[PDB]
């Protein structure tokens, strides 16, 4: 083949292509504020459904892909790592078996799970999975906000009013 | 015309036909718990958006039809009336100008507003409208739960993940 | 005809079908606040045009149908009745000649006058008709708001600015 | 449309049309006997699967629609209300969030839940939902029988004998 | 000699405000309040077209009288420096026409964001000046039918 | 597919492709000069409309996409970060919820907000959003110029002279 | 009653200048400064069409106030003798429209070659008069896109 000249166009933060939800799915996005932690400790963060997903009908919605990313205070230093895995007996061990890890030392600070949790219900997601957060430096409560974006079947129960009788 | 014989089939509570949201709309349903009130007092209840609708994008979604109904403790006695109207200077006066009133002395305890608030944004709904609740008997806090069902344009911002960059 | 089973679907307050104005007509809606009155007294309420209809031109517009309904404070008890009639010498006698009465003891507290006043002008409506309000219990001022909805030929005076 | 005269034919108790289960579904019907309760108390009644649905396999069957109705002793007086809701911290609060209430003051003492619980399994029905029963007068045990009819995917575990 | 016709699908609502008492050379703020027929939540969303302000003075009112419609000001007298038109009784045509300034805002926004300002070189007794406001706006649809009786 | 050799052609500062406004939109560009701040402090910078957009009519124009980038004095050292978010109770928390951050440690010191603020008016942009600026080292006033480029519906109020 | 529409491919930029303090009967020079959105080298080359000057006075300003746009003068008061239009508060229409005088010059040339002149028979306090300048010019193309991020 003949050499092809290319020009790599720089893009700004936020310009990345957004991953579109599957047909019939929507992406629910919510946050967890980290707890205070000593240096080099890995903390478990429970996954709790937002109120709009906690109803009897909505708890059963099947999960698709899952995205995890971190919101750090601008002054946070050191290494911050986070992942979603099946609940561990030892919190630190989560990073040894996670299929993706959000690590602030990387160019892209985000962990995508396109297959690992597909097909479970939202309730199962809360019961079986845990978020793990590691910091090389001690964390004050709220230093890190964990953003969890969970793709799931679109709820249908709210496509109509409650019958008036 | 020749007389037509008909049989009126009784239906149970809950069997009423559900009003389907308009194409491109969904129905958000949330509750307000009444405050304590003396007998025959009309109380104003602020309309506050649920967390899932409070974002910058979602606050702008246009309203369609609005439904109001009441959840009373089984032991609540006397007359209970509620309505949604433009915010009043005198709370009791709301019932004099409301286009619909949910009244527990009626066979159907519900107030539907198919036209009165169509086209405003959710933020406008919270800023301009108020729920009014009247009881002939004194109310303890939580005696009445006001159910507000607000049809509005389906949010689109959650049809994709946040770009990872 | 064979028997036809039916289900009567419940409907809520506010779900009733709106009556559409005739082509070339519009519905002007305004309110009158009741005066204080003793128990079982019938009070006369003057019909006054809202500002936008009180001009020389607009008060010539012809009336179609007229709707009356009542807004009660939630604490109002007893029987409240209202009607629109030609002005009476004895206020209570209005109810003996009214063709429709708004009565709070009914499921629909409203009175429709589809023919009685058809063809008169808004000025004639204000000059020849009166609203009558009866309460079994004493009324405090503003206890009852009378809603009058008058269908009339759509104004054309409002289709232009005042010349300057 | 020209006026259509109709005759409303009286129908007796028991003549109402039965709601047919969806294709591939069946309706399982069982009862719960109310516990003694003081006047104006709301009691929680656990939803327990009948023996034939309590196996590991059958408790996975998906729910469709749910019907609640009440069987009262003929001497029971006062107001009796019942509903099915997600389990409540305060029993009386169930009626504030129920989408349907069976109420003996109505002509039809029954509550239908056509959507609220659709898709959950029978095990989830037993684990997440509760029956709530309110009486204005004191209840003696067994005064009220709560009839629960749960539509669910037709069992296939019952299509064969236990292997031997 | 010829009235300015409203745009197709629009109509002109005309109402008045009676001036408050004011000392000489004071600029007074006058709130814009919708008439009753426009005060429903639905009618409050009707889009504005053109706006006309003109003044009705008692024939004995002397001195200079000026008025304008502008976005609400921190200093009332400063309205006349930014107003896109001023009704001024010393001119041949005592009126302020705003064909563009407010096009597209809702009646609610008109009432919330704009203020009428009125200046008089001499003291004003209450009701000496009637401010006339004519607001062209989308024709209401909510009042093309009676209120549902149920 | 057979291996495809490529040559990555170097490009200079300023050679990047410009993002074209949507049809019927235009990009308004203005600056805010940073305030003095201590090391590691996050400062809130109010978003104020330029004079030509501050009229009653123009502040109703709907927003499209928003671009943020930073102009640093050549001597500015340390880490400087900035973002646009909904107004925060704690300024430093903006970076935990921002969908994009302009960061001088990157090759491209800019943040694009293609969806977050789509559909709001310019007035709502000024009233609900805030610019947040963080520096690891102390900032002297004017050390950093924040460039905000807001895509919005093309004004039509500017298509005519003021009537006279 | 009807606004003058800009030519196809043109738009009207409108900005203001706050008058300086001035003694009675002095003519003051006011520099024409482009707004920020027009100050880029590219936007400075946009061709001018028509120009409008009008005045916003505090309602209590008395006496005669005049203003014009002309090529910069050695004697400020002499501007009014050669101005092709003068905004004069004693007239019915207080504005100066220049449909031809500056057609085709660039915005840069407008700022460099022309001056606003303001005369008042009485002393002016700073900000008593706001001069409004509306310059029709070719629509900018440079701001139809975001700045390249690299």
Residue numbers in the entry:
A (entry chain I), B (entry chain I): 26 to 190
C (entry chain C), D (entry chain C), F (entry chain C): 26 to 189
E (entry chain D), G (entry chain D): 41 to 190
Task: Give the exact sentences the study uses for this entry.
Once the calcium ions are no longer present to compensate these negative charges, electrostatic repulsion causes the capsid to expand. In the absence of divalent ions, the virus can also be artificially contracted by lowering the pH below 5, which protonates the negatively charged residues and thus removes their repulsion. In contrast, a sample prepared at pH 5.0 yields the structure of the fully contracted state with a diameter of 28 nm. The resolution of 1.6 Å is considerably higher than that of the extended state, which is more flexible and prone to partial disassembly. We then dock atomic models of the extended configuration into slices 1–12 (extended and partially contracted particles) and of the contracted configuration into slices 25–30 (fully contracted particles), from which we determine the motions of the capsid proteins. The contraction of CCMV is accompanied by a simultaneous anticlockwise rotation of the pentamers and hexamers, which are both rotated by about 5 degrees in the fully contracted state. It reveals that the pentamers rotate about twice as fast as the hexamers, adopting a rotation angle of over 3 degrees in slice 12, while the hexamers reach only about 1.5 degrees. This rotation of the capsomeres is accompanied by a superimposed rotation of the capsid subunits around the axes indicated with black arrows in Fig. 4a. However, whereas subunit A has already reached its final rotation angle of ~7 degrees in slice 12, subunits B and C have completed only about half their rotations of ~11 and ~13 degrees, respectively. The process thus resembles a collapse that is triggered when the electrostatic repulsion is removed that keeps the capsid inflated.
Cowpea chlorotic mottle virus is an icosahedrally symmetric plant virus in the Bromoviridae family that infects cowpea plants (Vigna unguiculata). The 180 identical capsid proteins are arranged in 12 pentamers and 20 hexamers. The asymmetric unit (highlighted) contains three subunits A, B, and C (magenta, green, and blue, respectively). CCMV is thought to achieve this by detecting a change in its chemical environment upon entering the host cell, which causes its capsid to swell, increasing in diameter by about 10%2.
